[PDB]
Structures are given as C-alpha cells and as structure tokens.
C-alpha cells in the first residue's frame, strides 16, 4: 500500500508551508483520502494540526516515506504538541527515527492538545511522503 487511511479528530485548521504535490495535499493525508506529497522540506517548515476544543489524544503516528520512495521521508524533524492548558509554545514528543516514522503513546500531561505539528529543523535533499497519519483517541 503506498498509503493507510485513518478517521483522525475533526481538525479546524491544517497548515503546511510545504508545498504540495498534484492530489497529494496534507488534508488528503490528514482525512483518509491519499498520501500527502511535498517538495524538499526546508529547516523551519511546519506541518500544524489545530482543534476547535481540547483534544484528548493516546498515540501519535506519523509515517514518512513509502514503499516506492523510501527516500522520500521527514529527517531531522520532530512532533510538537500544544497543550490545551498551557502557553504557546509547543513541546517535543516525537522524532522520526531510523524508519522515518514517528510513533508513540502520549504521555498523559500532553495528551489534552491544542495543535499538533511536524517541525522540520534541516533542510533535505529528497521530497516528503507521510504514508500513514493516525492520531489515535481513548475512543
């Protein structure tokens, strides 16, 4: 499969300063449709998920690459959350690891969310594939 749809939280925004590809969109990506597809990312670009209400989350995964373009994954770039109570400023809970995939639960004390984001902190030489979102509730 080049792609793993998943019915993720009702998002109010979603923002990426990636340039997409061609029916390859992040919101594609994000509801259930097809993988999203960006060109090179750059150190600073973001990926963000925002919610309307606190947003109680379990796990978080983000998968880069696909199985036609293993290459094409998220380096050196790591999943922040904001917190619903708190100030603005994101945490770190994830790193895309030697797999390009950023998996994990959520500790508790993160776990009730604001947003959601992919921070990319070096530019790449290869574009982006998240083959797999999946932004998994209690429920």
């Given amino acids: 499969q080049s792609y793993f749809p998943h019915q993720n939280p009702p998002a109010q925004k979603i923002?990426?300063?990636?340039?997409?590809?061609?029916?390859?969109?992040?919101?594609?990506?994000?509801e259930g449709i097809d993988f999203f597809w960006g060109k090179k990312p750059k150190k600073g670009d973001t990926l963000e998920f925002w919610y309307g209400?606190?947003?109680?989350?379990?796990?978080?995964?983000?998968?880069?690459?696909?199985?036609?373009?293993?290459?094409?994954?998220?380096?050196?770039?790591?999943?922040?959350?904001?917190?619903?109570?708190?100030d603005n400023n994101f945490t770190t809970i994830l790193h895309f690891d030697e797999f390009g995939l950023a998996d994990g639960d959520v500790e508790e004390e993160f776990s009730l969310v604001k947003a959601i984001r992919l921070?990319?902190?070096?530019?790449?030489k290869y574009w982006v594939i998240l083959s797999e979102i999946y932004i998994q509730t209690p429920d």
Avoid at 119 to 124: E, I, K, M
Wanted: charged share 20%; glycine share 4%; proline share 4%.
């Fill in 53 to 86: 209400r606190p947003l109680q989350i379990k796990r978080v995964t983000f998968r880069s690459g696909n199985a036609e373009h293993i290459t094409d994954q998220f380096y050196n770039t790591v999943v922040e959350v904001l917190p619903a109570f708190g």
């Fill in 119 to 124: 921070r990319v902190n070096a530019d790449s």
């Fill in 15 to 30: 923002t990426t300063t990636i340039e997409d590809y061609y029916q390859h969109s992040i919101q594609n990506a994000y």
